[PDB]
Amino acid sequence: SVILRDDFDSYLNPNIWVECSNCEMGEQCGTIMHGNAVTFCEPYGPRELTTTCLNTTTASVLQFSIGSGSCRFSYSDPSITVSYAKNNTADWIQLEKIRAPSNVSTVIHILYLPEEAKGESVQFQWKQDSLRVYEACWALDNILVINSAHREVVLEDNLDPVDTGNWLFFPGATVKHSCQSDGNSIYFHGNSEFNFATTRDVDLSTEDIQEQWSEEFESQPTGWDILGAVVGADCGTVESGLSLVFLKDGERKLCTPYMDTTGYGNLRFYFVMGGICDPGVSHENDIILYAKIEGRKEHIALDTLTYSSYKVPSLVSVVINPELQTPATKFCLRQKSHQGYNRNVWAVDFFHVLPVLPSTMSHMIQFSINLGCGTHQPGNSVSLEFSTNHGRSWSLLHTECLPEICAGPHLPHSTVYSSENYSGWNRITIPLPNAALTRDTRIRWRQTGPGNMWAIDNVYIGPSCLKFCSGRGQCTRHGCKCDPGFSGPACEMASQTFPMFISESFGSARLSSYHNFYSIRGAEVSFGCGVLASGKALVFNKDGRRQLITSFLDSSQSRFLQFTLRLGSSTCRAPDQPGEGVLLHYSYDNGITWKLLEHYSYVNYHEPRIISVELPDDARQFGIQFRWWQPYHSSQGEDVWAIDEIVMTSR
């Protein structure tokens, strides 16, 4: 899994590092990643850090963080080489050369290791060029050499005990019992620029794909924008048959036609630079991947393909953002610069697109998370992201796509988790998107606020348990571990029964008395919106989440769900912007899958309306919840809506 790892807070460890040249292991420059770093601050002397011998036979990537922290950063100091040597000789071969840190930011460097650096006796060396005074300092932290050999399709870790091989780094966190966890968890105390937990790469590839559109480039395609390319096989087989080989003098650019992407969530293609072809040599030969919407001049950046990452044909997987799911979106690859004909050559093949989620729902992630740890901390929020290029770039695992605002497939919730909406420990269960179903995919939980406390536990990543255990179980390597009171391979058999009716006129001003509802957020019971049915109504006034979730029901013998709704009229001013309407969802797997039932435009309900929703078969279920929710509002006393007289019956 890992050939080398050191955050310098786990011990210099003489089994990892030769004695350094004029360094200190500590906090002389403050936080780089977290805790201690290897710092260089002497005015003279060689500045050098060197590993002991390593077996890099199947080493793929070298990663490290570098920066000046709170120390003086460089304007004119000599640059810093990253090199390797074999057989404990002094013949250092340069891998990369980077200028000494010249901002305050810490940069994470990802280096793809050439073949000649893969051997049985290899060291790596960080060394600053010698002087002819160092006016500045620099520091190293979180050094990692990944192993490509030994590989898994499932990652399971409840930290009891932790498998260190499952994790790269978690800066700001410790594996320990805290935050009222079940045994150990990954606990962030809240002390610092980076606070995240990153998994190792997992093999989430699938045996076949169900693409509905593809381009194989067996002849120059019609309607594309193609500059500087020939249809051929100069770089060898990129996927199958011929490919687009960008070997010409001049501009090298590839653009799809404007496409209807409103049903697509994942763009894929195979790519290679060098190898059989002439390789790129520096980052000016990099490929820029961007998108464009028809009618609008702006280029939406997507990713960058680096000259060193794709020396063999490799799958590139990119998320088509909700802003890019339009009736006319095009995708473009452009090289920055090259050194002439047949120089720094790249090739692409088998462009194809996939839906947001695979039809099979074949893979999932599940975890427990606590935000705040027994104290609601505003601004405490964790984004769940994935990478398919060894951490070079990251994407939110799911991005919301809601009516009017988004034209793509309906996706109600982004994989973002804030303290405002969660209390204590909560289990999150998510089907993985197609774009993450690759062959080196890693996951990370990243704090996006500041000193916020949080923790994660019971992590599962891999093939989906049956029905994601129906929201009533933990998915394990060996199937569902069901919660108390539930049983079966998907935890579908329940011991309790649920009411086959609901009825609420909202006579009580105390939200704590509503046991027929699971959640009442952002609302009060009052006359603020006048009379809807009779007496008071539930008026959604407040800042933050505005939602109403019924308790668990049994709608198997129910025909309709009925309620009175009003959107706006001074204490009930109507929603004024698109997407500020109300959505009705249902879920019968404990909130894993919220299915859209109806959408009430912000433009249609100024006078109270008796709404009667005839239930489709899929919404007549034992153990179901109905939710009314306003995802967007101006969060004051604005865009107010109200509900009253909720009724469901059964025969």
Ligand SMILES: *[C@@H]1O[C@H](CO)[C@@H](O)[C@H](O)[C@H]1NC(C)=O
């Ligand atoms: C070095 O790594 C390779 C590939 O992982 C392995 O076959 C070899 O046995 C290793 N050498 C030693 C001394 O462990």
Ligand SMILES: *[C@@H]1O[C@H](CO)[C@@H](O)[C@H](O)[C@H]1NC(C)=O
């Ligand atoms: C250097 O390392 C190579 C690894 O392929 C080994 O075969 C060779 O014997 C070594 N030679 C010396 C002089 O150390």
Ligand SMILES: *[C@@H]1O[C@H](CO)[C@@H](O)[C@H](O)[C@H]1NC(C)=O
């Ligand atoms: C660090 O330098 C990079 C390179 O120009 C830049 O993108 C970034 O904004 C800099 N950080 C700060 C805090 O200026």
Ligand SMILES: [Ca+2]
């Ligand atoms: Ca550290």
Ligand SMILES: [Ca+2]
């Ligand atoms: Ca645990």
Ligand SMILES: [Ca+2]
């Ligand atoms: Ca082809």
Ligand SMILES: [Ca+2]
């Ligand atoms: Ca009422």
Ligand SMILES: [Ca+2]
């Ligand atoms: Ca508004």
